[PDB]
Amino acid sequence: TLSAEDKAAVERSKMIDRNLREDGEKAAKEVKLLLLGAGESGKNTIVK
Amino acid sequence: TTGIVETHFTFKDLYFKMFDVGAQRSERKKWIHCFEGVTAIIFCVALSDYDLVLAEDEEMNRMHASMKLFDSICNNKWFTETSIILFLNKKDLFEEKIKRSPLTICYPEYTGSNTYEEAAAYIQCQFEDLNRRKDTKEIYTHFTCSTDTKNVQFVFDAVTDVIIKNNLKECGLY
Amino acid sequence: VLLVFEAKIPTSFHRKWWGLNLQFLLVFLCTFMQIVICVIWLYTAPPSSYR
Numbered sequence: 001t002l003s004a005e006d007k008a009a010v011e012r013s014k015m016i017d018r019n020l021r022e023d024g025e026k027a028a029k030e031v032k033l034l035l036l037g038a039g040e041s042g043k044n045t046i047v048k
Numbered sequence: 049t050t051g052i053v054e055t056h057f058t059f060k061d062l063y064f065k066m067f068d069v070g071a072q073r074s075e076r077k078k079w080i081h082c083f084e085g086v087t088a089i090i091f092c093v094a095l096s097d098y099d100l101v102l103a104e105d106e107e108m109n110r111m112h113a114s115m116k117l118f119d120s121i122c123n124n125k126w127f128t129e130t131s132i133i134l135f136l137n138k139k140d141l142f143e144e145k146i147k148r149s150p151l152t153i154c155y156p157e158y159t160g161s162n163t164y165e166e167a168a169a170y171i172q173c174q175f176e177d178l179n180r181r182k183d184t185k186e187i188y189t190h191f192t193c194s195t196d197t198k199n200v201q202f203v204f205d206a207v208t209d210v211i212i213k214n215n216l217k218e219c220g221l222y
Numbered sequence: 223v224l225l226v227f228e229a230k231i232p233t234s235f236h237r238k239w240w241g242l243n244l245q246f247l248l249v250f251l252c253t254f255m256q257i258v259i260c261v262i263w264l265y266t267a268p269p270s271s272y273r
Contacts, residue, residue, distance in 0.1 A: 028234055030063040031207055033133075034083045036121060037092030038114065039070060042137025046092050046192060046199060047055065047068070062231075087232075208230055215226050215233060219240055 059200050062207070066090070084126045088210055090133045090203070091118055095171060096141035098154035111154050111171075119178045127185070129217075131210045133203060134175060134189040136168070186213075 002010075037043040053068035072079065097110035122132055143164050151167040152158045155174065160166045168191070176187050188206040192199055216222035225240055238244075 025234075029231060030065050031232075032083075032086045033064060033066045033203070033207070034086045034089045035066045035068050035092070036089060036117070037070070037135075038094075038110070038117075040097070040110070041092040041094045041114065042135065042192065043068070043070065043092045045137060046090075046135050047066075211230060211232065212227060215229055215237075218237070219226055221223070221226065 057200075059204055062204065064203070064207075080121075080124065081126050086130060087207055088131045088133050088203075089121065089127065090135065091121070092135045092137055093118065093175065094137045095168070096138040096145060098142075098151060098171075099145055099149055109154050115175065115178065118175060122178060122185075122187075123180050128181060129184045131186045131188065131206070132179075133206050134172075134187055135199070136172065136175075136189065136191050137193070139164075139168070139191050139193045142168070186210075 035043065035047070050071040053071070055066045055068070057064050067083070093114045094110070097114065100110050102108040102110050102113060118132075118134075121127065146162050146164055146167050150158065150162050151160065151170065155170070158167075158170060160170065172189050176189065179185070179187055186209075188202070188209075190199065190202050213222060225236060229236055
Protein backbone atom coordinates (compact mmCIF):
# COMPACT_ATOMS: atom_id res chain seq x y z
CA THR A 1 0.00 0.00 0.00
CA LEU A 2 2.79 2.41 0.97
CA SER A 3 6.58 2.26 0.73
CA ALA A 4 8.85 2.37 3.77
CA GLU A 5 10.25 5.70 2.57
CA ASP A 6 6.64 6.85 2.29
CA LYS A 7 5.92 6.01 5.93
CA ALA A 8 9.16 7.72 6.95
CA ALA A 9 8.08 10.85 5.07
CA VAL A 10 4.67 10.68 6.75
CA GLU A 11 6.08 10.50 10.27
CA ARG A 12 8.62 13.22 9.46
CA SER A 13 5.76 15.46 8.30
CA LYS A 14 3.85 14.66 11.49
CA MET A 15 6.86 15.53 13.65
CA ILE A 16 7.33 18.79 11.74
CA ASP A 17 3.66 19.69 12.22
CA ARG A 18 3.81 18.85 15.93
CA ASN A 19 6.85 21.09 16.37
CA LEU A 20 5.01 23.84 14.47
CA ARG A 21 2.04 23.47 16.83
CA GLU A 22 4.32 23.76 19.87
CA ASP A 23 6.03 26.83 18.43
CA GLY A 24 2.71 28.50 17.65
CA GLU A 25 1.43 27.80 21.15
CA LYS A 26 4.63 29.29 22.57
CA ALA A 27 4.43 32.35 20.31
CA ALA A 28 0.81 32.92 21.33
CA LYS A 29 1.71 33.87 24.91
CA GLU A 30 3.74 37.07 24.35
CA VAL A 31 2.88 40.72 23.79
CA LYS A 32 4.25 42.47 20.69
CA LEU A 33 4.70 46.24 20.97
CA LEU A 34 5.79 48.51 18.12
CA LEU A 35 8.14 51.31 19.18
CA LEU A 36 8.16 54.54 17.15
CA GLY A 37 9.48 58.07 17.44
CA ALA A 38 12.74 59.79 16.49
CA GLY A 39 16.37 59.53 17.50
CA GLU A 40 16.15 62.58 19.77
CA SER A 41 12.68 61.62 21.01
CA GLY A 42 13.65 59.95 24.27
CA LYS A 43 13.31 56.64 22.45
CA ASN A 44 16.67 55.38 23.70
CA THR A 45 15.94 56.71 27.19
CA ILE A 46 12.54 54.99 27.29
CA VAL A 47 14.17 51.76 26.14
CA LYS A 48 16.48 52.33 29.11
CA THR B 49 24.29 46.18 11.67
CA THR B 50 21.22 48.24 10.83
CA GLY B 51 17.69 46.88 10.70
CA ILE B 52 14.82 46.23 13.08
CA VAL B 53 15.95 45.88 16.70
CA GLU B 54 14.21 43.30 18.90
CA THR B 55 13.95 43.59 22.68
CA HIS B 56 12.54 41.17 25.27
CA PHE B 57 11.65 41.60 28.92
CA THR B 58 9.45 39.85 31.47
CA PHE B 59 7.30 41.88 33.87
CA LYS B 60 4.58 40.39 36.09
CA ASP B 61 4.63 37.10 34.16
CA LEU B 62 4.21 38.76 30.75
CA TYR B 63 6.82 38.53 27.99
CA PHE B 64 6.96 41.91 26.26
CA LYS B 65 8.61 42.06 22.83
CA MET B 66 9.38 45.44 21.24
CA PHE B 67 10.51 46.25 17.71
CA ASP B 68 12.53 49.41 17.00
CA VAL B 69 12.31 50.41 13.33
CA GLY B 70 14.08 53.77 13.46
CA ALA B 71 16.95 52.35 11.41
CA GLN B 72 14.61 51.95 8.41
CA ARG B 73 15.50 54.91 6.17
CA SER B 74 13.12 54.14 3.30
CA GLU B 75 9.47 54.26 2.26
CA ARG B 76 7.29 53.16 5.17
CA LYS B 77 4.29 52.38 2.94
CA LYS B 78 5.87 49.01 2.04
CA TRP B 79 6.65 47.32 5.36
CA ILE B 80 4.30 48.90 7.90
CA HIS B 81 1.59 46.33 7.14
CA CYS B 82 3.90 43.73 8.69
CA PHE B 83 3.11 45.16 12.14
CA GLU B 84 -0.65 45.02 11.55
CA GLY B 85 -1.14 42.55 14.39
CA VAL B 86 0.55 44.32 17.31
CA THR B 87 -0.99 44.86 20.74
CA ALA B 88 0.09 48.50 21.01
CA ILE B 89 2.20 51.22 19.41
CA ILE B 90 4.52 53.02 21.84
CA PHE B 91 5.17 56.54 20.54
CA CYS B 92 7.93 58.71 22.01
CA VAL B 93 7.69 62.51 21.74
CA ALA B 94 10.27 64.81 23.34
CA LEU B 95 8.58 67.79 24.98
CA SER B 96 11.78 69.88 24.91
CA ASP B 97 11.69 69.94 21.08
CA TYR B 98 9.28 72.87 20.70
CA ASP B 99 12.13 75.38 20.97
CA LEU B 100 14.36 73.28 18.70
CA VAL B 101 14.17 73.29 14.91
CA LEU B 102 15.08 70.56 12.43
CA ALA B 103 18.15 71.64 10.47
CA GLU B 104 16.88 69.92 7.31
CA ASP B 105 14.26 72.63 6.68
CA GLU B 106 15.48 75.40 9.05
CA GLU B 107 11.82 76.44 9.43
CA MET B 108 10.47 73.14 10.80
CA ASN B 109 9.96 72.60 14.52
CA ARG B 110 10.69 69.03 15.53
CA MET B 111 7.43 69.07 17.49
CA HIS B 112 5.49 69.66 14.27
CA ALA B 113 7.34 66.76 12.64
CA SER B 114 6.51 64.58 15.65
CA MET B 115 2.87 65.61 15.32
CA LYS B 116 2.90 64.72 11.62
CA LEU B 117 4.46 61.31 12.26
CA PHE B 118 2.04 60.56 15.10
CA ASP B 119 -0.96 61.52 12.97
CA SER B 120 0.30 59.48 10.02
CA ILE B 121 0.84 56.34 12.09
CA CYS B 122 -2.34 56.86 14.15
CA ASN B 123 -4.87 57.19 11.31
CA ASN B 124 -3.22 54.55 9.12
CA LYS B 125 -5.54 52.15 7.30
CA TRP B 126 -3.95 49.19 9.10
CA PHE B 127 -3.98 50.50 12.69
CA THR B 128 -7.74 51.14 12.79
CA GLU B 129 -8.17 49.15 16.03
CA THR B 130 -4.70 49.43 17.61
CA SER B 131 -3.99 51.43 20.75
CA ILE B 132 -1.19 53.98 21.07
CA ILE B 133 0.79 54.62 24.25
CA LEU B 134 2.24 58.13 24.21
CA PHE B 135 5.41 59.03 26.12
CA LEU B 136 6.02 62.76 26.56
CA ASN B 137 9.73 62.78 27.40
CA LYS B 138 12.26 65.22 28.87
CA LYS B 139 9.73 66.94 31.11
CA ASP B 140 12.52 68.61 33.09
CA LEU B 141 14.16 70.37 30.14
CA PHE B 142 10.66 71.53 29.26
CA GLU B 143 10.26 72.73 32.85
CA GLU B 144 13.22 75.09 32.61
CA LYS B 145 12.73 76.10 28.97
CA ILE B 146 9.08 77.09 29.50
CA LYS B 147 10.38 79.40 32.22
CA ARG B 148 12.78 80.76 29.61
CA SER B 149 10.56 80.74 26.52
CA PRO B 150 6.77 80.46 26.12
CA LEU B 151 5.11 77.65 24.19
CA THR B 152 3.82 80.24 21.68
CA ILE B 153 7.08 79.68 19.77
CA CYS B 154 5.73 76.31 18.62
CA TYR B 155 1.96 76.83 18.58
CA PRO B 156 1.19 80.48 17.72
CA GLU B 157 -2.29 80.35 19.32
CA TYR B 158 -1.31 78.97 22.74
CA THR B 159 -2.69 81.92 24.76
CA GLY B 160 -1.38 80.86 28.15
CA SER B 161 1.15 81.47 30.89
CA ASN B 162 4.66 80.00 31.23
CA THR B 163 3.85 77.41 33.89
CA TYR B 164 4.68 73.75 33.34
CA GLU B 165 1.18 72.34 33.84
CA GLU B 166 -0.71 74.49 31.33
CA ALA B 167 1.80 73.85 28.55
CA ALA B 168 2.05 70.14 29.36
CA ALA B 169 -1.72 69.69 29.21
CA TYR B 170 -1.81 71.79 26.05
CA ILE B 171 0.73 69.61 24.23
CA GLN B 172 -1.06 66.49 25.44
CA CYS B 173 -4.38 67.81 24.12
CA GLN B 174 -2.90 68.88 20.78
CA PHE B 175 -1.49 65.38 20.38
CA GLU B 176 -4.63 63.50 21.42
CA ASP B 177 -7.01 65.59 19.30
CA LEU B 178 -5.21 64.26 16.21
CA ASN B 179 -6.96 60.93 16.82
CA ARG B 180 -9.75 61.14 14.25
CA ARG B 181 -10.88 57.58 15.09
CA LYS B 182 -12.32 58.16 18.56
CA ASP B 183 -14.24 54.89 18.65
CA THR B 184 -12.06 51.81 18.05
CA LYS B 185 -8.73 52.89 19.55
CA GLU B 186 -7.42 54.60 22.67
CA ILE B 187 -4.39 56.74 23.50
CA TYR B 188 -2.67 56.37 26.88
CA THR B 189 -0.36 59.26 27.74
CA HIS B 190 2.46 59.49 30.27
CA PHE B 191 5.22 61.95 31.17
CA THR B 192 8.02 59.44 31.92
CA CYS B 193 11.29 60.71 33.46
CA SER B 194 11.43 60.31 37.30
CA THR B 195 14.46 58.05 36.69
CA ASP B 196 12.33 55.13 37.88
CA THR B 197 10.56 51.97 36.72
CA LYS B 198 7.03 53.41 36.64
CA ASN B 199 7.24 53.43 32.84
CA VAL B 200 7.16 49.64 32.54
CA GLN B 201 4.33 49.62 35.08
CA PHE B 202 2.33 52.05 32.94
CA VAL B 203 3.01 49.95 29.84
CA PHE B 204 1.91 46.79 31.66
CA ASP B 205 -1.32 48.36 32.91
CA ALA B 206 -2.14 49.85 29.50
CA VAL B 207 -1.48 46.52 27.75
CA THR B 208 -3.73 44.75 30.26
CA ASP B 209 -6.47 47.29 29.53
CA VAL B 210 -5.99 46.81 25.78
CA ILE B 211 -6.25 43.03 26.12
CA ILE B 212 -9.38 43.23 28.26
CA LYS B 213 -11.09 45.66 25.89
CA ASN B 214 -10.13 43.49 22.91
CA ASN B 215 -11.84 40.53 24.59
CA LEU B 216 -14.87 42.71 25.36
CA LYS B 217 -15.17 43.80 21.72
CA GLU B 218 -14.75 40.19 20.57
CA CYS B 219 -17.65 39.28 22.86
CA GLY B 220 -19.65 42.29 21.65
CA LEU B 221 -19.86 43.65 25.21
CA TYR B 222 -18.24 46.95 24.24
CA VAL C 223 -18.54 38.77 32.05
CA LEU C 224 -16.42 37.30 34.85
CA LEU C 225 -14.60 34.95 32.47
CA VAL C 226 -13.86 37.84 30.11
CA PHE C 227 -12.39 39.98 32.88
CA GLU C 228 -10.38 37.07 34.29
CA ALA C 229 -8.28 36.72 31.13
CA LYS C 230 -5.03 38.70 30.91
CA ILE C 231 -3.36 36.98 27.93
CA PRO C 232 -4.42 36.81 24.25
CA THR C 233 -6.88 34.01 24.80
CA SER C 234 -6.98 30.76 22.83
CA PHE C 235 -8.73 28.06 24.87
CA HIS C 236 -10.96 30.07 27.23
CA ARG C 237 -12.15 32.01 24.17
CA LYS C 238 -14.07 28.84 23.29
CA TRP C 239 -15.76 29.28 26.68
CA TRP C 240 -17.55 32.57 25.89
CA GLY C 241 -19.29 31.85 22.58
CA LEU C 242 -22.93 32.80 22.17
CA ASN C 243 -24.14 29.33 21.18
CA LEU C 244 -22.34 27.86 24.18
CA GLN C 245 -24.15 30.33 26.45
CA PHE C 246 -27.48 29.25 24.98
CA LEU C 247 -26.43 25.62 25.43
CA LEU C 248 -25.77 26.19 29.15
CA VAL C 249 -29.18 27.85 29.52
CA PHE C 250 -30.56 24.78 27.75
CA LEU C 251 -28.89 22.43 30.24
CA CYS C 252 -30.48 24.16 33.22
CA THR C 253 -33.96 24.51 31.74
CA PHE C 254 -33.63 20.95 30.41
CA MET C 255 -33.13 19.49 33.86
CA GLN C 256 -36.23 21.43 34.89
CA ILE C 257 -38.34 20.23 31.94
CA VAL C 258 -37.18 16.63 32.46
CA ILE C 259 -38.42 16.76 36.06
CA CYS C 260 -41.71 18.35 34.95
CA VAL C 261 -42.28 15.78 32.17
CA ILE C 262 -41.60 12.84 34.48
CA TRP C 263 -44.03 14.38 36.98
CA LEU C 264 -46.81 14.88 34.44
CA TYR C 265 -46.29 11.40 32.98
CA THR C 266 -46.10 9.38 36.21
CA ALA C 267 -48.59 11.00 38.63
CA PRO C 268 -50.39 13.92 36.95
CA PRO C 269 -52.44 16.39 39.00
CA SER C 270 -56.21 16.54 38.79
CA SER C 271 -59.19 18.67 39.81
CA TYR C 272 -61.13 17.74 42.95
CA ARG C 273 -64.53 18.79 44.35
